[PDB]
DNA sequence: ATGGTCGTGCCGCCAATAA
């Protein structure tokens, strides 16, 4: 069974005989977003088990339903805050050495390098890798002005995790991405799943 | 039973007219409307705010002072009403809270004008589980009380009741060391008790909003509830005459864009350049623009962050005030006619070109166009000939015989309308 | 192992880096066969092909065809080298098939035959796992080596550089 | 210090010409 997402992208399961004409199966990935570095292990564990189901054998009408019960719980859950904070980490690659970047007020991973630097020990230097998590800081900046350090959070009293920003920008773009080409499921139903506003994402027409 | 007073559950499941569901949905709206404004303009002690209140409660029908047993038709208004806000004000983040404030200030003063005697059973009847003490009681532990608490002046024990509630409960009095701790029970004046009845309603409200979201989307498929759902937040030169001008002055083409921008609350890109230009023709700035475009997005259940961080940067350039600082000239009609073709979900372009005559036709009859008119501009449309026809409409819209001008831009149109009109 | 086919110092092997290697082995190529090599100073082209996909979900069994090693066969197939392709963004013609073999193809030859026998080695039943694992980094690293040669054709600071042969 | 092709998320910038 094979679902081909874009060029590029698509997830599949490999027929691997063993004997007698048994074959057993194993899933594989080619592109998506769950095999890149950049995106939360949350929104990558929720893909792999969306694919998981997906790619089962089952009736298309009960994979919906268990898609629905699964992110009902996860939407529960991030707003608990059961889940730990080793999770909520995005790591990035850094190119140039962290001093050089022009840009370096609208890049959180370098925001995040310039800090490490100038306080740490150990100094990050160019192809090294840098961790970063969104927190609420109540200063009304934006989303990519508010990167901090992962040992910046346990240390402080002020920041708290944004639930926001990984319930809508992190977890609703890779499920809704992997489930385009499968019908019944749409961005406002997951959106409404997860408890977030509808309003934003497709809506409009009354 | 006490139907002056009552915590929110238990659906109703009676069945009612559809012109009482939408009656029900607009006194609600406008009562709680109004309490706002009494909150607002008044502070919350003043006898003026009593009798406004109160007086408008008396005049929507709704349940007041418990001394008249048998108001049972308010109390039905009120349960359904309720409910049937608790959809539309369920949807956006920013009408949650608006609606919680404004309930929650409405049920303190429901239970401020309880009379003295009757609050017992109520507390029974809304699932709460506390209790009073007999004088006795009072008495042994008079000192121990006033010992106890807060920082109210005066060892004066007076006549207001003194409530024994479970420790679990009074969390936010004992944390401070302001109330009396015994045998697992706290013993609280009647003055804080509201505090914590509002708190635990709050809870109870929060999560019934959440999970009615959640399970609303079943609840669009119904036809009938569409318009309910989605308008009860709707609804030299100033901001409060625009539509007007949209029936008298404006040619079909932006009066088409002003209806879809009211009646839609959006617009795409080929729209918001046209009519965006056409409106800084007129004479319109940049704040009043800016307030505009921001009020009727907002009517889209958008908060003002995605508006500011998306569009107003493209107002802005729209009138010269970034990048080389360039100021624009609206639309000519030639490239109006000719440029940028609409598609499905548009309602930019000509009217008189891209719409076929089997919709111009009825187009023309929703603005009140005579027959032998109609007949004259289609005949002129099928010639191609766009301009004349859309000076005839001038004509036939302004009640003169010849305009005496020549027609090539929408701004002129507007000029020369309100040569004569004003 | 690397070290021994590129013939290069050791130290520099464990630096990283797949110039180098390829400068090295060049180098030993042409002085073997007396030859004169260039001097030490002192997008660009077409790619691949990729197909428009049809995108979806698929129930039924699917084939998938592979080529062994694309570039460095279709190197030994056409007699793709310096020595026997003309030269001076425009495609050169292919060579008369009469002429003997070149020097690059018989270079990258070696490579693939080292590759294959690491493959059967590989195929061997009752392996430690952690046999297996290694023989699979050691074929990947000796298809990296010989899949580098073809990229050194396009580095405008490469001592062999040549734009139409990666072209072709 | 190997080559090219493909997609995803942040930003700023532009069209226009009556009277
Ligand atoms: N890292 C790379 N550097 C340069 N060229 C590469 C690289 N990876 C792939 N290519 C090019 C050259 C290859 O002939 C072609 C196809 O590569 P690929 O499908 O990975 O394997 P391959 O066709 O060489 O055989 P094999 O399946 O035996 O590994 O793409
Ligand atoms: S002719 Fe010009 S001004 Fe008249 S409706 Fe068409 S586009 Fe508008
Ligand atoms: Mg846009
Ligand atoms: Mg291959």
Known sequence: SLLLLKKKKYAALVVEPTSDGNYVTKQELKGLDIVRRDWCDLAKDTGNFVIGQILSDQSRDTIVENIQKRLIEIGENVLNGSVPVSQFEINKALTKDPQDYPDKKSLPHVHVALWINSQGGRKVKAGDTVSYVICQDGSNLTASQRAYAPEQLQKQDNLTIDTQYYLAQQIHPVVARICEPIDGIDAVLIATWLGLDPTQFRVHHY | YPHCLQFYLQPPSENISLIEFENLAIDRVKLLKSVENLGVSYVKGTEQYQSKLESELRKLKFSYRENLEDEYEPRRRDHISHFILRLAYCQSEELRRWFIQQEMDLLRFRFSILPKDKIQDFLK?????????????????????????????????????????????????????????????????????????????????????????????????????????????????????????????????????????????????????????????????????????????????????????????????????????????????????????????????????????????????????????????????????????????????????????????????????????? | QITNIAGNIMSRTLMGGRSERNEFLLLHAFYENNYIVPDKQIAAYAGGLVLDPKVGFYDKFILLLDFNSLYPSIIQEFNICFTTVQRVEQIPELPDPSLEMGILPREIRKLVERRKQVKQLMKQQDLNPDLILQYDIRQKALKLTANSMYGCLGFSYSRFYAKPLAAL
């Open chain 2, 125 to 422: 009847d809304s699932q709460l589980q506390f209790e009073a003490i007999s004088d006795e009681e009072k008495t042994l532990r008079e000192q121990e009380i006033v010992a106890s608490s807060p920082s109210l002046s005066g060892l004066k024990l007076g006549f207001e009741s003194i409530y024994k509630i479970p420790f679990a409960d009074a969390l936010d009095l004992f944390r401070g060391r302001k109330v009396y701790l015994e045998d697992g029970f706290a013993y609280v004046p009647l003055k804080d008790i509201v505090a914590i009845i509002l708190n635990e309603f709050r809870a109870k409200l929060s999560k019934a909003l959440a999970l009615t979201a959640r399970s609303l989307p079943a609840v669009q498929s119904d036809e009938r509830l569409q318009p309910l759902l989605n308008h009860l937040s709707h609804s030299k030169i100033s901001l409060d005459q625009i539509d007007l001008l949209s029936t008298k002055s404006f040619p079909p083409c932006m009066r088409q864009l002003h209806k879809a921008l009211r009646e839609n609350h959006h617009l795409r890109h080929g729209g918001r350049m046209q009519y965006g230009l056409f409106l800084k023709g007129i004479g319109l700035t940049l704040e009043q623009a800016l307030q505009f475009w921001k009020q009727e997005f907002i009517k889209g259940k958008m908060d003002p962050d995605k508006f500011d961080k998306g569009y107003s940067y493209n107002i802005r350039h729209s009138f010269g005030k970034e990048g080389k600082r360039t100021d624009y000239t609206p639309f000519s009609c030639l490239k109006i006619i000719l440029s940028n073709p609409p598609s499905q979900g548009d309602y930019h372009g000509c009217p008189f070109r891209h719409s076929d005559p089997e919709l111009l036709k009825q187009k023309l009859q929703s603005y009140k166009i005579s027959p032998g008119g109609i007949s004259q501009i289609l005949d002129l449309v099928k010639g191609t000939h766009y301009q004349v026809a859309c000076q005839k409409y001038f004509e036939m819209i302004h009640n003169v015989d010849d305009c005496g001008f020549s027609l090539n831009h929408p701004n002129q149109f507007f000029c020369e309308s309100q040569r004569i009109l004003n």
